Write a protein that binds this DNA or RNA. Structure first.
Length: 158
RNA sequence: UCCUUGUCGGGUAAGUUCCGACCUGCACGAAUGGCGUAAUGAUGGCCAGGCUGUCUCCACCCGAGACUCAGUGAAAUUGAAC
């Protein structure tokens, strides 16, 4: 019935403008067996995305995922040609920004994992019926990732 | 194999060419030889310093033609032409 609400924290590339919804059917990739690409005759899917703040050529954003299928959040974020930061399988080729500092380039090399994190989960108790709310602290790699981007954005553009 | 010439750096105010690198890269490929290689090359491509009419923008001058006169004297083409 799609009752449980799930929230995700992600970092993507590009200067975003506004949030919205994506509704694209998805099936298996015709050629590569480790990719799950968008297909017009695929399984219907719904995903929503919002933005909390922008950066130089990247962004920090909060979004909610309805169906927790295999790598749903990555492709729907990549179907708008705005791939995730550091994603090796679904994210785009590395593209450092103009006038990037050496420390910034190292951070992207250091952050060699996918930019995804779940912070807030809401559930209904089995035998009580009272909502529980929990929050997940931002992981250390993401803390430095947003820190280096904040310093770079406040130095180049400003 | 593709997308945002791939995009960051040098080179430039601005670089579809050049240089070591990120990757989603592995085909070639090890005597139909593979890697590196000092020196060498009227060898391919790029950059820098001096230099200049290459150029903005050409101007003048020196000579040989082009022009007139005297002599000799072709050419390809041509159905006919007011």
């Amino acid at each position: 019935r799609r009752e449980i609400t799930r929230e995700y924290e992600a970092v993507a590339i590009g200067h975003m403008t506004a949030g919205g919804t994506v509704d694209e059917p998805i099936s298996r990739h015709p050629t590569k067996r480790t990719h799950m690409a968008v297909h017009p005759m695929g399984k219907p899917a719904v995903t929503h995305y919002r933005i909390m703040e922008h950066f130089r050529v990247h962004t920090r954003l909060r979004l909610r995922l309805e169906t927790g299928r295999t790598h749903q959040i990555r492709v729907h974020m990549a179907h708008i040609t705005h791939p995730l930061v550091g994603d090796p399988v679904y994210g785009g080729r590395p593209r450092p920004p103009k006038g990037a500092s050496e420390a910034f380039i190292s951070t992207l090399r250091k952050f060699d994992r996918q930019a995804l994190h779940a912070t807030m989960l809401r559930l209904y108790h089995p035998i009580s019926g009272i909502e529980m709310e929990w929050h997940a602290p931002i992981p250390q790699d993401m803390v430095e990732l947003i820190e280096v981007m904040r310093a770079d954005f406040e130095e180049h553009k400003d």
